[PDB]
Symmetry: C2
Subunit: 176 residues, 2 copies
């Protein structure tokens, strides 16, 4: 299967843009909709690929898989696309050094796990494609989990891991 995904902010698409929050660094132009395409009057295009696990260990994968919801739940009419760029200092670090910041210090997985099965979370990579961002992260959930997701954001943005994030944008969406 084609692991590449494109996100085109413009006048067409499956998702209506509710709000774009330019958290850190240059933002993305406000647009009417986002069109998601599998494969590679529009304002911007983002792309990334699905890839293998980079940090999670087996016990962590087992916990996530036990409560990970699927995409495209009927109830999951809200979504958020959050492109993220990390710093050169982050990328120069070795594998043991990044894993320790990611979990042992920041507890990325343990914290995110608390918000499943409510939130469906998916990760795409794009630093290797030469894109402006390093990751395209995608979340979808029913309105009942909006407050919980907003809470999770504040939590991760306070984390040690986020000291290495240098560009970030929120594209809040509603399923059409």
């Amino acid at each position: 299967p084609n692991n590449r995904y494109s996100f085109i902010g413009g006048r067409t698409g499956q998702w209506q843009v509710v709000k774009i929050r330019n958290v850190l660094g240059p933002g993305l132009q406000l647009v009417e909709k986002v069109n998601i395409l599998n494969g590679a009057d529009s304002a911007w295009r983002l792309q990334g690929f699905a890839s293998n696990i980079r940090y999670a260990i087996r016990t962590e994968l087992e916990a996530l898989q036990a409560v990970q919801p699927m995409l495209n739940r009927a109830e999951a009419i809200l979504a958020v696309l959050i492109p993220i760029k990390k710093s050169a200092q982050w990328w120069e670090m070795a594998q043991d050094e990044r894993r320790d910041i990611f979990e042992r210090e920041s507890h990325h997985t343990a914290v995110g796990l608390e918000y499943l099965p409510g939130v469906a979370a998916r990760l795409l990579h794009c630093r290797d494609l030469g894109e402006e961002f390093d990751f395209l992260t995608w979340f979808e959930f029913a309105p009942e989990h909006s407050s919980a997701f907003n809470e999770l954001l504040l939590r991760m943005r306070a984390s040690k891991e986020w000291e290495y994030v240098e560009r970030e944008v929120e594209v809040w969406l509603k399923r059409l």
Copy 2:
């Protein structure tokens, strides 16, 4: 810098093909030369990108960086391009499972270090590009190290890590 690299088997290039050893699975067609281009009458093209560290820890990087030779040494008139693909079962494993096979069991980095500084080794990734191979590995050295390189290839093709390799080709080259 652009991190994409292309290897075109045909009748032009910086490198003459000495031989091709179809080690495992379908091979590559014999050609006169290989052309290497930086960016995205020819028989085949391979491509991959340089990426961040996936397994090596800080102390291993420091030991590697202490002896790793540069590319394009005057005496490094031989080169070997070895595309590699690993199994689906490999990519399904978690990060800890793969690290433990990579170093704890196979000692890929420790064995590799023994063959530096003679052998310059570079790694490119292409599974994420949808390529038929997962990695393009590049090696260049002087003739005095040809025998030691063949020794290295045998020590690695015998390790537990290589039990997950399901396709492999050796393209031996000579600088023009």
